[PDB]
Amino acid sequence: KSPTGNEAALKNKNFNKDVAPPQSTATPFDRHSRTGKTDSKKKLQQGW
C-alpha cells in the first residue's frame, strides 16, 4: 500500500477498544538563583 490514500481505506479505526490513560497531567525553587555566579560587594560598590 505505497500511496497513503489507498491504505487509508483499509486501515480500521481501532480506538474504542483501548482505554485512555488514568492520568495525563504533564504540563521548582524560583527564589534560589541557579546562575552560579554570585555578586561580590566590590562589584556592587563599584557600580552603584
Partner: protein, 142 residues
C-alpha cells in the same frame, strides 16, 4: 364546529412501507416517512388538495393514493426543482426526490462512490470521523 364520525377513522396507516399514526395531523404525520420533511409534506398536501385541518386517519383512500403519487413524481405537479431532495443526480443528471427505502440506498451509493475513488471525504466516512472539517480534539467524545 365539532363533528362526529363512526368507522371511518383509521388508527394506523401504511404509506411507503412506513407506519403512520392516524391521529396525527396530516402535514406532520407524513413526516414519519423518511425523506419527507415538514416543508416537503406541507407542499404535497397543498398539491393534492388535502386540507391540512385533517388528521391522518381522516383521509380516504382516494386522497392517500393522490398524495403518494405526488411525492413520487414531484416535477410532474409543478414542484420546483430546487425544492427537491436529490437534484442533478450523479448518474443521469435529472432532479429526483428519494423517499423512505430509496433514501438510504442512494445515501449508501454515495458513500462507496466516494470510497471507491478513495477521496478524502470517503476515507473519513470509513473511519467514522466527522467529514465536514469539524474539530475532533475535544467534542468527538461519543
Amino acid at each position: 364546529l365539532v363533528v362526529q364520525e363512526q368507522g371511518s377513522f383509521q388508527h394506523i396507516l401504511r404509506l411507503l412501507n412506513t407506519n403512520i399514526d392516524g391521529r396525527i395531523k396530516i402535514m406532520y404525520a407524513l413526516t414519519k416517512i423518511r425523506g419527507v420533511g415538514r416543508r416537503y409534506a406541507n407542499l404535497v398536501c397543498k398539491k393534492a388538495d388535502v386540507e391540512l385541518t385533517k388528521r391522518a386517519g381522516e383521509l380516504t383512500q382516494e386522497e392517500l393514493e393522490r398524495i403518494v403519487t405526488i411525492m413520487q413524481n414531484p416535477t410532474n405537479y409543478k414542484i420546483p426543482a430546487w425544492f427537491l431532495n436529490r437534484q442533478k443526480d450523479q448518474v443521469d443528471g435529472k432532479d429526483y426526490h428519494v423517499l423512505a427505502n430509496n433514501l438510504e440506498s442512494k445515501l449508501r451509493d454515495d458513500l462507496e462512490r466516494l470510497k471507491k475513488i478513495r477521496s478524502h471525504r470517503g476515507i473519513r466516512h470509513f473511519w467514522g470521523l466527522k467529514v465536514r472539517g469539524q474539530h475532533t480534539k475535544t467534542t468527538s467524545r461519543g
